[PDB]
Design a protein around this ligand. Structure first.
Ligand SMILES: [Zn+2]
Length: 344
């Protein structure tokens, strides 16, 4: 017999109590002894709660969103929500209102967490645009400047530059750094019909991310076979790394000095991630790992959120990818200095 907040087991195949499917939702205090609020799972699309928690713990993000309340829209709803979650004392909060706003805009399936992540960021960034203020903060925080050049025979496929708020990660050909590097610079081929010519042709496209934004939001979009190689790789989920734009390419390394012939080096730290838990029943759910700075003790602590259960955990557990019941879904890296700023 174990307390529900027990978050390890001996055998890697047994889902520990803290990760289990919690009772339907009335006291939740036995599930949470922290000062951080969990979310009521009795809402539509309750898997979005894991992603709401994730963003709630990005300082640049929290602070900007709650700041808007001092100026209707699911930005401001997210504002009210974040604010309730901070000042509530670990008391449960509801994403009810936020869910409503989302709906108005008319089992965890493959890609749905990633799809919701892209939608949410894009939607927040667009609303941020709707203020005649400027009012760029989210755009500049998450914005990946992505250039697509096309080698083609017909001279049409004009180069495009779009600002994307997240980076989609697919397989390469071990740790996470080369995956991110590949997503930020790659050359691919595909069959295509030219919108201008109508010619069908194999085109070659070079996709280049131009900048290293202060928040990198990663959507893992891998095959389950690729996930099996991730679990076998110890230390796949790198906790911190250094990046630089070197010769029009993003280069990412574990240490700063591995970065050569570049004049500006940026440090990133893992802030949090959302993971899918798969039960023995094959029942499925999202949890959230986050890292929060305690500037008095000059250290970070790691928290795991499972709906309304919240438990402080070791960094070892927080970075462990080897559990067959665990799959990373969405990962956030954050400028190391930003990560230490206070939540207002
Ligand atoms: Zn053409």
């Amino acid at each position: 017999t174990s307390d529900i907040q027990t978050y390890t087991s001996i055998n890697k195949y047994e889902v520990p109590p803290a990760y289990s499917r919690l009772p339907l939702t009335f006291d939740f205090t036995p599930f949470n002894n922290t000062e951080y609020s969990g979310l009521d799972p009795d809402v539509d699309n309750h898997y979005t709660n894991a992603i709401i928690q994730l963003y709630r713990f990005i300082p640049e993000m929290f602070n900007f969103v709650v700041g808007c309340l001092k100026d209707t829209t699911l930005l401001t709803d997210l504002g009210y929500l974040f604010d309730m979650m901070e000042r509530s004392h670990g008391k449960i909060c509801s994403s009810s209102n936020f869910q409503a706003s989302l709906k108005s805009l008319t089992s965890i399936k493959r890609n749905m967490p990633q799809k919701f992540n892209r939608f949410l960021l894009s939607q927040l960034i667009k609303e941020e645009a709707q203020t005649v203020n400027h009012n760029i903060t989210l755009n500049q925080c998450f914005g990946l400047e992505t250039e697509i050049r096309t080698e083609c025979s017909c001279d049409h496929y004009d180069t495009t530059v779009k600002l994307l708020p997240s980076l989609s990660i697919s397989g390469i050909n071990q740790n996470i750094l080369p995956y991110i590097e590949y997503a930020m610079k790659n050359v691919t081929q595909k069959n295509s019909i030219c919108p201008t010519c109508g010619k069908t042709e194999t085109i070659t496209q070079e996709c280049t991310v131009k900048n290293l934004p202060s928040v990198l939001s990663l959507e893992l979009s891998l095959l389950d076979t690729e996930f099996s190689n991730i679990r076998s790789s110890k230390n796949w989920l790198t906790s911190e790394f250094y990046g630089s734009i070197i010769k029009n390419k993003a280069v990412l390394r574990s240490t700063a000095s591995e970065l050569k012939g570049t004049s500006h080096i940026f440090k990133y730290e893992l802030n949090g991630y959302v993971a899918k838990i798969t039960d023995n029943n094959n029942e499925t759910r999202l949890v959230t790992y986050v890292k929060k700075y305690n500037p008095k003790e000059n250290c970070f602590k790691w928290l795991m959120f499972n709906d309304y259960l919240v438990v402080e955990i070791t960094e070892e557990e927080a970075l462990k990818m080897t559990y067959p019941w665990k799959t990373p879904e969405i990962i956030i890296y954050c400028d190391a200095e930003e990560l230490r700023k206070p939540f207002f």
